[PDB]
Structure 1
Amino acid sequence: QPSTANGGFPSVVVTAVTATTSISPDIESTWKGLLAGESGIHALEDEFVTKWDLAVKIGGHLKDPVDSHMGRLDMRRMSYVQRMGKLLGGQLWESAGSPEVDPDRFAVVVGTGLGGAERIVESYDLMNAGGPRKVSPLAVQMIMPNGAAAVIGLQLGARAGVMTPVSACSSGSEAIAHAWRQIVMGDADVAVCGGVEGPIEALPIAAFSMMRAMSTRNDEPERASRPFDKDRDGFVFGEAGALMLIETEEHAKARGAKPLARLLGAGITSDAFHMVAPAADGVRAGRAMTRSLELAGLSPADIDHVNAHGTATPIGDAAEANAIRVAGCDQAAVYAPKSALGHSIGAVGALESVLTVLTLRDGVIPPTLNYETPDPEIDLDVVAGEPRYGDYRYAVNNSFGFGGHNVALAFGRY
């Protein structure tokens, strides 16, 4: 039975990371800010908040808006998530040293929650106002949810597959999972993978608010996202996109790339429980963690750190606490980055995967913000107060998305 530990799978390393967040457009600055206890969450200044009198008046816009980097041409030719993908793709390749790779061994896998949806409404409006010939010949390629991955694959020249998994909050982690599979099954030697997501606007707020899924602690925005805290009251939107470069250890060594961490295994399960609520017992979500360990060749006692999904909904954090216990990982040091960065849906699993890599690289876990009165019914070792420096050898990143999609990624220190 093949595993990374027993050599049945090739060794796969993470060699570059990039992200744009509510704290910073630079991932190393985001990381420094997280360690300093900074939050990206603010009072929403946009006109649409007062226009609709939204119950939610907080969130984290990108520190550096994607379109401050987009000229007239890109604003014409691409949907928002495509522009974010193009921006992150070029940043990642530069960060990797702009390597010359074999396009036929190079894959792209980028998840997203929705796609180029603003272009659906625009095309609708243009046709209503001017007839069918006022729809752009570019409408299809901007609207299609595979569009961001296709843009990145075309930009970087990836000819070993361009894939787009859609699984809501787990999309960006699932993308990394499928990129790992594409390499270990022999279809590729190198892959760009992660997730992109659109911005905060009034309709997204209304849609998730009507599930009671979002915090309404508007008077103290940086205090609103409280994963595992007794007084949590839902998640906070925090915009992001994130990509990483993974490749076989042999491929990295042959080009002089220095690994930041190892990607050891990936588990994908499903709850088949409810269309938006996670299963209370945490069993299938814990099984995704277990499966990632089976493929890595690890036991639960090896897991020093869990980067929680931790959205700060009442039911979600309780389900995840059961999942971590089910997987035998409840002695691990737990971090919930949505406490500081908010929830970026289809990007967030990729962002948190990057954070897990940086935790392993630097031997430090940032504080979970707002963890002040731990929920009495949840007993996890949540890092809080200030960063915890420790000997983290292996870690699991959790993403448990709406729809019941469970993805666990097992990483190791390089």
Structure 2
Amino acid sequence: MSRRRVVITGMGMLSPLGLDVPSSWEGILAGRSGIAPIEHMDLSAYSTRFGGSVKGFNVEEYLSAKEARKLDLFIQYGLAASFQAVRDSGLEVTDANRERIGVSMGSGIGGLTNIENNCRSLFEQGPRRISPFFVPGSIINMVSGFLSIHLGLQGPNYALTTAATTGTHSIGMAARNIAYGEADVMVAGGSEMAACGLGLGGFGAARALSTRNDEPTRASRPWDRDRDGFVLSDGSGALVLEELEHARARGARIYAELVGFGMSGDAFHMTAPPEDGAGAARCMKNALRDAGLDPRQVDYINAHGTSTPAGDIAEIAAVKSVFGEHAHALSMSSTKSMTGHLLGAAGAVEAIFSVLALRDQVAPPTINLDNPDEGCDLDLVAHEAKPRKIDVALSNSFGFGGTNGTLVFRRF
């Protein structure tokens, strides 16, 4: 009953829409696509040749060239986001507080690019060509590791990996740490860069990607009757979470309050969701109960909304189960229509968009929703952003293994 309150004091991001939060959010509010033909590798033999890339990233803004060549791109992206968020927070780390400052930055796949480059070296020339930085520069927990070293952070240090739910769980479990007194501040989010042959070929073999090579900006089409799978995107999201009285005492700017976190398992199938979204329903009901909110107080849902046939339907059903007749009053959108699917970073960037929807009183759009499929009759915010009253925003992520996560945010 007497846990502590958690607010968002700082955010940061790289996405296919921009190298920070303001440029990303301007893209989102404008209905801009970040999806394009992939520049950095030869995809002649692959059925999908496009995705959301991070464009014009300069790691030397954040780290010396020396430090950065030790690190996979997913670590560089995660540190960029983390540093933007910590700067945006204005937090001063000292000897009196560094043990109360932790980090929870995850990833889905981790350093898959590095692993493939080092595999090339291994098979061509044998194990002598392997970098000595291969292990520490490629393992998932090294975003949390490096950030704690750079900022001197001595509180809880860990890394989730729960597929497309990674970002959501990382934030939720960091908020729990603060509420239960293990830390006063947490840096939390996720990052991903799986745009290599093993990623594109991995999701291609499973037949899970959109193959709309002719029109990449139209490929990601959540709830649309001609959807054909997800678009693979790269990037990172980070939030500075903080105990409310900590934030108030130092006069921090508060974007919003994190009131609710929920988890569930579908226990259904490795990749497919259940047709009724029964596990998504339970997860959302857990998050609302955790927040002490009735379903009728939710104004905006940032949906998972990946542009898959089964997925998108199951989310509509879940939302209709949870909210009932209130399903027709709230606005729900998929920013994956613009961003594509950022995998382990998806829930981190979507947590930020949900916070900014609270800040700006605006529901971002679902682009490409030309012909909503059977049952897709909610306010899906098709085509253009909708100014509206938003007191409570909810963010859903649902991943491989049937792992589900919801965050509930409230205007402060």
Instruction: Output the TM-score relative to the length of structure 1.
Output: 0.93
Correspondence for 2:407 among 400, 406, 409: 409
Measure the CA separation in 2 of the matches of 1:22 and 1:255. Answer: 34
Q: Secondary structure at the match of 1:139?
A: coil
1:354 to 344, 352, 355: 352
State the one-letter code of the partner of 1:106: I
Contact 1:22 1:41 in 2 (8 A): yes
Q: How does 1:224-303 map to 2 (within 5 A)?
A: 224-303=219-298
Structure 1 SS opposite 2:273: coil
- Can you list the C-alpha shifts for 1:271-308, whole angstroms capped at 9, x where unaligned? 11111111222111111111111111101001111100
**Which residue does the alignment assign to 2:335?**
337
1:87 maps to a residue whose letter is: A
CA distance in 2, matches of 1:132, 1:405: 37
Post-superposition CA distance 1:118-155 (Å, at most 9, x none) = 33344455556666565444333123221122112222
Measured in 2, the distance between the counterparts of 1:118 and 1:202 equals: 8
1:5-48 CA distance string (max 9 Å, x none): xxx32111101111111111021111112111111012333441
Amino acid at match of 1:96: S
* Cα shift at 1:105: 0.9
**Shift, 1:213, TM fit:** 1.4
Establish whether residue 82 from structure 1 lines up as the match of residue 80 from structure 2. Answer: no
Name which of structure 1's ranges 307-316 and 269-278 shifts more when overlaid on structure 2: 269-278
Matched, 1:20 2:17: no
Code of the aligned partner of 2:287: S
CA contact (8 A) 1:61 1:199 kept: no
- What displacement does 1:66 show? 5.2
* Deviation string, structure 1 residues 290-342 (Cα, Å, up to 9, x no partner): 11111111010011111000001000001111111222262321010000000
Identity of matched residues, %: 38
- SS at structure 1 position matched to 2:77: helix
Q: Deviations over 1:189-231 (max 9, x none)?
A: 1110000101422321121122221111222111111101111
Q: What letter matches 1:275 in structure 2?
A: M
Of stretches 392-401 and 200-209 in structure 1, the one that deviates more from structure 2 is: 200-209
In structure 2, the residue matched to 1:138 is: 133
Mean CA deviation greater in 203-212 or 118-127: 118-127
Which segments of 5 or more consecutive residues in structure 1 lack a partner in the other structure? Answer: 3-7
TM-score by length of 2: 0.93
Q: Which residue of 2 aligns with 1:5?
A: none
Q: Give the 3-state SS of the residue equivalent to 1:292 in structure 2.
A: helix
Look up the match of 2:115.
120
Gaps of 5+ in 2: none
Q: d(CA) in 1 for partners of 2:396 and 2:104?
A: 18
Structure 1 window deviating more from structure 2 (241-250 vs 200-209): it is: 200-209
The aligned amino acid for 2:209 is M
Deviations along 1:344-376, one digit per CA (max 9) or x if unpaired, are: 100011000000000011100122101121112
Which amino acid counterpart does residue 229 of structure 2 have in structure 1?
G
Aligned residues of 1:196 and 1:347 also touching (Cα < 8 A): yes
Structure 2 residue identity aligned to 1:337: T
Structure 2 Cα separation of the partners of residues 38 and 123 of structure 1: 36
Partner of 1:62: 54
1:366 alignment counterpart: 364
Distance 1:321 1:172 in 2: 22
In structure 1, the residue matched to 2:376 is 378
Match of 2:24 in 1: 30
Q: Which amino acid aligns with 1:325?
A: K
How many residues were matched structurally? 406
SS of the residue 1:265 aligns to: strand
The 10-residue stretch of structure 1 (122-131 or 244-253) with the greater mean CA deviation from structure 2: 122-131
1 CA distance for matches of 2:393 and 2:35?
26
